[model samples]
Target: GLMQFTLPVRLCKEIELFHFDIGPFENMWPGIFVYMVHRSCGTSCFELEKLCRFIMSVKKNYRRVPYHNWKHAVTVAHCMYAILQNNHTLFTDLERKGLLIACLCHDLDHRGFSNSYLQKFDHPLAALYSTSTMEQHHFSQTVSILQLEGHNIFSTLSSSEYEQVLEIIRKAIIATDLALYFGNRKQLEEMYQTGSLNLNNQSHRDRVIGLMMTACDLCSVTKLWPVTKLTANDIYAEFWAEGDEMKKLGIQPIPMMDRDKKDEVPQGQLGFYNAVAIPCYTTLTQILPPTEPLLKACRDNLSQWEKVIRGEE
Candidate 1:
C-alpha cells in the first residue's frame, strides 16, 4: 500500500513540488517527475508503477557528470511539468506525454562534452551521426532505455500509438540541439510576428513542442538568481572538465569552457541567454501566452547576469 501511494503521499506533503521557483526536492525528483506524468496524463495504477520503475532506471543510465546528470534531468522534467500544469490545455494528451518523456531523457548518457568537442576530436559518436551527433545519440539512448526490461511503460498503448509517441519523442529529443533551436526559434518568431501561428495546425504545434524542449532544457536560466547561479557553477564545472581534457589533447575550447577564462562566465552566459534561451522562451510566450512566466524569469535572470558582467553584483 505504501509503495502504491508514494507519489500521493509526497504530493500531499509538498503541494508546490513542481513549482518553477522550487529547486529539486533533495534529490527525490524521479518520483516527483513520474507522479507529474501520472497526474497530467491519465494512466492505470499498474502503468504508473511501471513508469516509476522506468524513471528510476533512466536515472541510473544518466552519467554523474556535474550538470547533465540525473539532477539536470529532474530540472528539465520539472520545467516541462510546470509548463504542462499551467498550460495543459495547449497540448493534446499524446503531445503532453511525448514532451514530458523527451525532457526527462534528452541528455541520457552525456559524457560532459558538446557536439563540437566530439567532432573536433573525431569522436566515434561524431562519426556515427553526421548531424546533431549528441542529440541523435541521446535519442538512441532514450530508445535503448525504453527497450530495457520493465521500462517500456508505453507498452499499454496500441502498436500504432506507441510508434507515434516514439516519433514525437525523437523529434523533441533532437530539438534540444542549439543548431536545431536556432532554426525553429527563428521560424516561430517569424510566425508570431506575422500572426501566423496556429495552434490547431500540426506543423505549428510540433514546432512549439520542439522549442519547448529547449526552454525546459535551460530551466536553470529561468530559476531564481541564487539557484540559477548554483546551476551555472555546476554546468561550468562540466565545461571546465571538458576544457581540461581538450588541453591534454592539444585542443582549444571556447572561452566559456576554458578554465583560464573563467572570468568570462557572466558575459558568456549573458550572450547565451540573449542569443538562445531568451529568444526561445520569448517566441514560446508569443505563441502560447501562458508561457510568459518562462520569458519573465529568463529576463530576470539575465538582469542578474548583466549586473555581474558590470561588477554590480
Candidate 2:
C-alpha cells in the first residue's frame, strides 16, 4: 500500500529551516525533499509523482550505513537550500537547481567507508576510477537514476540546459571529496586574499560552487552542540566499523577510525575543524557574508570539542 505524504505545519515554513535539527524528522524526509525541490525548481519543472518516485529511488539506493545514508543526504541538501535562499542573487536559477540536486545525491550508495579504504583493499571501484573513486561512482549512480523511466525530474529543461545542469551536478558531487577540496582551497584562499575572486569569471564561479559543496557536505559541524555530537557519533560509528574490518584483515586502522582509540575522538574532531571545517566555513563566509552564522556555529562547535579535550565539558 502506498502511503500519503504531507508536510507538517512547521515544516511548511521555509525560513530558518536550516537551523532545525533534522535528525528527529526521519519520516518526513521524502516530503521535505519534495517540498524543497518544489520550492527551488518550482512546479513547472517537475511532476509531483515523478519527483516522489525519484526521491524514493534515491533513498532506496543508499545503503543502510551508520552515516552517509539518506538522512545525511537530506541534511546536506537542506543546508544547500538554506545557502541558496540567502544568496539567491549569486547563482543563476539553473545553478541553484543543480546545486540542490547535487547535494541530495552527493553520497548516493555510499558504502560506509572512505576512498582510502577502497584503494587499500583493491576494490573494483578504485580500478574503475583511479581518482575520487567513490565520488565518481556517486555521480554515475545519479546519472543512472536520472536515466531510469519516470525519474527524469529535469525533463522540462531544454537539451542544452539539461546537459549544463548535469555538468554542474558532476562537478559539485566530485567536489565533496576532501582531496579536491584540499587541492582547491589554497587556490581559492589566495584568490580571496588577493581580491581576485570575480563571480563573473567562469573559473571563479566553478571554484565557489566547489567550496559550497564542501561546506554543505560538512554542515553537521556547524549545527548546535547536541546535534553536532549525535552526527559526529554516527560518523565515527561508520569509521570504527571500517576499522574493525581492517583489524580482521590484520591491518591497523588510523587513530580516527580505530575503536580502541575512542578517547581520541575529541582531538580528532578538533583537528578536523582546524584543518577542514573551520577554514572551509571561514572562506565561505568571506565569499558570502550572509553565511556568517554558519561560520559562527562551526567555531562554536570547535570550542565545544576543545572543551571536551580539555576535560571542561
Candidate 3:
C-alpha cells in the first residue's frame, strides 16, 4: 500500500517454516483447527470428524512461529469466536457456523508479519499471491473433497444456512488489511458513530474484515494483565531484533531510535503509533470497551523506552 511492499531481500530463505515443526504434516495445520472450531460450536461428532479429515485433504506451503503461522490464525479465530459471542447481536446459527469456517482459512498462506515484512523480507509469498486469492484457495480446499465438485463448504448446508456461512467466510479473511489499516479504521469509526455498521456488501465486508482481523490481532492487549504483559514483551523483542538487522545493513532503518540516528528515532516511534497502531487501536476502542490492562502495560513500558532515549535508564 505504501507505493510498494517494504520487505527486504536479505531475509528470504529456502526452507519453509511449517516443515520444521516435528509433527505429522496433517496434524499441525489450519484445517485441523477448523475441525476443532466445528466441534466447539457443538456440531455433531460424526460431522466434526468428517470435517477434520476433509480439512487435512490439502497439502501446501505453511510456516510456523511468531507471526503468519497456524498459531496466529488459530489465535485470531478463537478471539473472533469469543468476541462475536460477546457482541449484542446473537449470531444466527448460520452466522456462527460461517464464522467457524472463516477462522479456519483466514490466513491460508500467510507470509509472516505484515505485508511490509512480506515485501521487505522479499518473502515472495505476496508477489505470488493476492489476499483474496490465497483465502479462496483455502476455502476451496476445505469444501473440495466434500463432494466431487471440488468446492463449496456449504454443499451440505441448507439453503439459508449456506448463505450465512458464505458471508462469514467472505468477510473474515478480507478483513486482514495491513495496507489500509488507517483508512479502514477511519471509515469504521464513522459508521459506528452513525449507528450504521453494515458488513453485508462486498466493500463493507472488506472493511469489516479489516476491523475484525485487527481486533483479533490486538486482543492480547486487552486480555488479562499477565497475558498483556507477556505478549507485549514478545512483540517488543521481535521489533528490536528486526531493528538490529536494519542497523547491520548500510540501509537507514525505518526508525533510528537509540542507535545514533537520533534524527529519525523519535519521529519513527511517533509515526508508528500515530499513523498506524494508535489510530487504528484507538478507533477499535470505540467499538470494544476500554482495555485498562493493555493501556497500563503500554504506559508503564513507554516510560522505560523514554528513559533509555534520554540516556537516563
TM for every model, in the order presented, reads 0.91, 0.94, 0.59
Q: Comparing 1 and 2 by lDDT, which wins? A: 2
Off by over 4 Å in 3: 1-40, 44-46, 54-61, 88-90, 113-153, 158-164, 195-206, 224-313
- Per-residue lDDT tens digits for candidate 1, residues 35-88, read 667666654523765787878878888887888888788778778877887786
Ranking by TM-score: 2, 1, 3
Clash count per candidate: 0, 0, 9
- What TM-score would you give candidate 1 relative to the actual structure? 0.91
| Two-way lDDT contest, 2 vs 3, winner | 2
Candidate 2 stretches with Cα past 4 Å from truth are 1-9, 13-17
lDDT of 2 by residue, 1-313 (tens): 1333456666666435556556566777877776676667565556677778888989999998988899989999989988887887888878977888899899999999889888888899999999999999999999999999999988888999999999999999999999899878888889999988899998888999999999999999988799899898899999999998888778999888899999888988988999999999998998898988888999999999988988988
Q: How far is candidate 2 from the true structure (C-alpha RMSD, Å)?
A: 2.7
Task: Estimate, for each residue in 78-135, the C-alpha lDDT of model 3 and write its tens digit.
Answer: 5565555445253455655666556656666543344544445555555665554445
Worst lDDT 10-window in candidate 3: 11-20
Question: Which runs of model 1 end up more than 4 angstroms from their true locations?
Answer: 1-27, 43-46
C-alpha lDDT of candidate 3 relative to the true structure:
0.50
